[PDB]
Amino acid sequence: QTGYLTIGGQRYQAEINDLENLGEMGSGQVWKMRFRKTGHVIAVKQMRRSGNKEENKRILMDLDVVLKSHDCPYIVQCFGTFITNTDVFIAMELMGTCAEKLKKRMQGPIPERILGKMTVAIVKALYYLKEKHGVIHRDVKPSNILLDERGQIKLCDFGICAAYMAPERIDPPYDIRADVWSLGISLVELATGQFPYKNCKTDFEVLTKVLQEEPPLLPGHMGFSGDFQSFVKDCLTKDHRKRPKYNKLLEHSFIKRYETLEVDVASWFKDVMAKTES
Ligand SMILES: *CCC(=O)N1CC[C@@H](Nc2nccc(Oc3cc(C(=O)Nc4ccc(CN5CCN(CC)CC5)c(C(F)(F)F)c4)ccc3C)n2)C1
Numbered sequence: 001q002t003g004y005l006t007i008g009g010q011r012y013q014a015e016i017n018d019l020e021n022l023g024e025m026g027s028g029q030v031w032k033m034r035f036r037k038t039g040h041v042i043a044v045k046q047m048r049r050s051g052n053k054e055e056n057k058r059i060l061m062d063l064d065v066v067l068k069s070h071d072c073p074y075i076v077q078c079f080g081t082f083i084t085n086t087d088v089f090i091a092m093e094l095m096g097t098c099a100e101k102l103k104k105r106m107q108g109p110i111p112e113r114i115l116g117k118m119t120v121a122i123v124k125a126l127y128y129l130k131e132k133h134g135v136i137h138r139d140v141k142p143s144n145i146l147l148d149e150r151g152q153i154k155l156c157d158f159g160i161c162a163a164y165m166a167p168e169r170i171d172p173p174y175d176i177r178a179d180v181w182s183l184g185i186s187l188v189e190l191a192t193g194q195f196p197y198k199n200c201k202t203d204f205e206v207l208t209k210v211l212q213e214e215p216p217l218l219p220g221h222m223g224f225s226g227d228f229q230s231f232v233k234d235c236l237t238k239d240h241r242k243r244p245k246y247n248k249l250l251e252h253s254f255i256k257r258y259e260t261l262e263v264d265v266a267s268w269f270k271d272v273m274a275k276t277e278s
Pocket residue numbers: 025026030043044045062063065066075076090092093094095096097098099100101129135136137138139142143144146155156157158
């Protein structure tokens with residue numbers, strides 16, 4: 001724990017009392033706060049310190065990774081931590097909302113052009129986590145994909161019908177390829193406005209469906225581009241040994257196209273926010 005909040009490339013001296021509470025955001029505990037010294041509005045997570053040694057280092061270990069991801073623009077930035085007797089406070093850049101909530105606000109699909117930018121960002125985030133830190137995510141899903149009013153899209157981990165788990169994770173006798181599967185499911189969900197696995201009696205039913213049924217692919221009658229359908233189908237390869245790794249996914253036409261294509265995510269996000277409530 002250093003003595004500073006690091007924000008937009010600068011290091012500001014800080015103490016817990018410099019933070020002013022503007023209200024809770026979640027429903028582990030999350031507050032919108034104002035840093036007095038600068039007026040920057042930030043997101044702060046409050047965690048109780050659990051007395052398990054190993055169970056309290058994976059707190060530290062995961063922070064370590066995010067703190068050292070300043071050079072990746074697709075990962076949510078951590079500004080710093082405050083540790084008191086009972087509590088760790090974790091200060092993060094505030095993102096407007098997550099993809100899950102945009103789906104709800106939309107009451108329907110998110111357009112492909114937005115999803116294309118989201119795909120490049122999330123794939124690059126994961127690739128970065130693997131190559132620079134040797135970590136895997138393990139919970140890729142729409143609620144862990146953050147957007148803001150500057151049109152940025154970033155990967156996060158909130159740590160707290162729908163199923164995103166790869167078949168080989170449901171029932172082993174997992175490496176990066178499980179996250180690839182979770183990306184694909186996420187995309188079908190966001191692109192259709194609908195959970196991919198349809199007839200959801202129970203949790204067991206759904207996990208059985210993942211194991212037994214064919215992957216739910218993008219439907220062909222919604223104008224989805226051929227390369228988006230292909231990308232999703234490659235992510236949703238059941239046999240994990242056949243499933244592409246990130247370097248192969250980064251070579252895919254869908255990605256290459258959306259890297260260069262100018263898309264105005266900012267204005268879209270602003271529109272959506274100005275036209276909806278929760
Ligand atoms: C659906 C949106 C929603 O409900 N919101 C409520 C709050 C709103 N905005 C917001 N803005 C920014 C941050 C935030 O929440 C936080 C996020 C994080 C965070 O993302 N933590 C984090 C931890 C760990 C990792 C690294 N990984 C290591 C490998 N594995 C472990 C096996 C997974 C974790 C990441 C990483 F993925 F790199 F991004 C991120 C922390 C604190 C807060 C407050 N809410 C939107």
